[PDB]
Amino acid sequence: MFFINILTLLVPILIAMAFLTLVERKILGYMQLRKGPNIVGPYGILQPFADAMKLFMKEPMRPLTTSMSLFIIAPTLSLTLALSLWVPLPMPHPLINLNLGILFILATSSLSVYSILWSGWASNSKYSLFGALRAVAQTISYEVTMAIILLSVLLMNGSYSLQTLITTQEHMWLLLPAWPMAMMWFISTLAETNRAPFDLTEGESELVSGFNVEYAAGPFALFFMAEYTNIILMNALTTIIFLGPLYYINLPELYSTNFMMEALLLSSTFLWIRASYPRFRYDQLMHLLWKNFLPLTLALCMWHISLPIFTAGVPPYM
C-alpha cells in the first residue's frame, strides 16, 4: 500500500507542475494582453504534454568539452531532490513523518544548489561558468537569511516538525504574529527557486541561458521539472508554515482543499511577480539581503527569542 501512496504523491505532483507551466504561460499571456496556448489542447491543456514529448524525442547532444559524469548526474540529482523535498510535507498527514522536517528541507535545498553548480561547471562553457558563480552568490545570501527566518518562526513554534505547525496554527495563522518574517521568507523562497525578479542563474538577457546553455533536450526538461516542482514546493511550504489551513480531526479533506487553494494563490503570486518586475543584478541581490533582511531578521530573531520568555508563552516540546 505504501508504493501506492508513493504513486499518489509523485504522479499528481508531476501533473501539477506540468499544468503549472501551462498556467504560467496563460497568466503571463493574459497579463501581456494576449492569450496563452489554446490550440494544442481544448484550452491548451495538451501543451505541456506536447512540450514534454518534443523534449524527450530530441537528441541530448553530448558536447565535446564536457565532464560527462557530472553533466549527466546534475539534472537527475535536481529532479530527485525536488521529489525528495516533496516527501515530508503534511497535508495534514505526511507520507514520511520527520522530527527534523525543516532541517531536512534546508539540506535538500542546498543539495539542489549543488546540482545547479555541478551542471554549470561540467558544461565547460563560459556562460555556464557565469551561471554557476551567480548561483553561488545567490545561495550564500538566501541561505543565511532563510536559516534565521526559519529559526525565529520555529521558535514561535515548538519542535522542528510540521504537524506541530498544524497544531500551532489550529486557531490562528502565523502571518499575523510574524508577518515581516513572512515577507522576508517569501522573498527568500523566490531566491531559492531562482525566480523573477532575481533569477540570475538562467538569466535570458544577461547570459544566454546560464547553466542550461549547453543542455539540450532531455536533461534540460529534467532541470525544468525540478525548478517548477521547487516553485510549487516553496509555495506549499510557505502556506503550511504561515497561512495555516483549517484542521479538523474528523475530516482532513477541508485541510487539503484549503492548502490547495492557498498554494495555488501563492504560485499565481510567483507568476504575478515574474510578469511585474525586472531583474536584479546579482551583486544587488546580495547587497539587498545582507544589508536589509539580515540585520532586520537578526533583530527579529532576538525579539522572538525574548517574546515567549516575557509573555510566558513557551511552546510545548511535543
Partner: protein, 70 residues
C-alpha cells in the same frame, strides 16, 4: 478572457488535493480506520511495540479493550 486560465488552475487544484487526501485514506486503510500513530519519542514507540505484542496478530493497530479481562 481571464476565465480561460481556470481549466489549468482546476487541473492543478485536483492534482494538489489528491496527494494529501490519498495519504490520509491510505493511512486509515493500513491502520484499520485510525490514523498513522506517529511516534516522536521512545515512549510512543514503546507504546506501539507493546500494542503489537498485546494484539497477538503482530499488528499494533488492533486495539484490545476490556474484553481481554474476565
Amino acid at each position: 478572457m481571464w476565465f480561460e486560465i481556470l481549466p489549468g488552475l482546476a487541473i492543478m487544484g485536483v492534482c494538489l488535493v489528491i496527494p494529501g487526501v490519498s495519504t490520509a485514506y491510505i493511512h486509515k486503510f493500513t491502520n484499520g480506520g485510525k490514523e498513522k500513530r506517529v511516534a516522536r519519542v521512545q515512549y510512543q514507540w514503546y507504546l506501539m511495540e507493546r500494542d503489537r505484542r498485546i494484539s497477538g496478530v503482530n499488528r499494533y493497530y488492533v486495539s484490545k479493550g476490556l474484553e481481554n479481562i474476565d
